[PDB]
Amino acid sequence: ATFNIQNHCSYTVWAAAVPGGGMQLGSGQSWSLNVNAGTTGGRVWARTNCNFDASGNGKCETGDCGGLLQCTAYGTPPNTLAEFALNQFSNLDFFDISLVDGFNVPMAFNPTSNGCTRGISCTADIVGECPAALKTTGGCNNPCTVFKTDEYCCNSGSCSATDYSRFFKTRCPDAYSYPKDDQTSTFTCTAGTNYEVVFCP
């Protein structure tokens, strides 16, 4: 499958993918990423305010993946996430936008083939609106990241929405706002669909 990863922000971002790596995308530039059929735990995200040396080692203000330009591991919150698992049960791809690891950059994540048309977006000014307890440089953290309790992180107990998850959910109703926000955040397409991930759509 092909992911068309497009930076429509006026600022440069450093696109990241696992599997895939990462590259600098100036405003208006795009990356076509091949993603094999059957991939699980897939993510695409943007990183902000990075500075990398000649060998691809360095730092990003949001979404840093172990100091690498070409990510092999997930990024450090906050990072708006396009998540996917391809060719799963019932001849389906499963995909979502997640704010469970926070928000940095607005995002659309849409199918582009196979007669799959229903996509996803989170475009609110979540950084400008972020509550004080969640705010950080370049982003808005999920309360699981900030507080690290089961109320927000749901390893055990009864996982329900919280005022801090609801902040994200009412502003981006399409996206996961807390770990068990499954019922209203799950998108599917026929297996084998292509996708776009657009920063600042």
Side-chain angles (χ1 to χ4, degrees), residues 8-34:
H8 290 183
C9 304
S10 67
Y11 46 88
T12 296
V13 303
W14 290 255
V18 172
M23 60 170 70
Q24 182 175 322
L25 293 182
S27 178
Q29 295 190 325
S30 306
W31 173 14
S32 287
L33 173 59
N34 186 74

Side-chain angles (χ1 to χ4, degrees), residues 47-147:
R47 301 169 290 177
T48 65
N49 189 18
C50 303
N51 182 6
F52 289 106
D53 74 12
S55 296
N57 298 139
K59 190 181 195 50
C60 298
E61 186 146 62
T62 63
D64 182 74
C65 60
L68 303 180
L69 174 62
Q70 295 186 272
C71 298
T72 57
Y74 292 168
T76 299
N79 49 17
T80 310
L81 299 177
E83 302 184 307
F84 47 91
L86 308 183
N87 307 263
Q88 300 305 108
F89 189 58
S90 305
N91 196 42
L92 296 175
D93 293 346
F94 282 75
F95 69 114
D96 61 86
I97 293 177
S98 175
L99 307 176
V100 173
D101 292 329
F103 178 104
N104 58 348
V105 174
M107 175 180 285
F109 181 14
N110 301 324
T112 67
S113 77
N114 266 334
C116 198
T117 55
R118 176 67 173 177
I120 322 175
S121 71
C122 177
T123 63
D125 184 8
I126 296 297
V127 178
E129 298 154 14
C130 190
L134 305 181
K135 195 171 177 57
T136 193
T137 309
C140 188
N141 272 316
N142 192 93
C144 172
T145 305
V146 177
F147 300 108

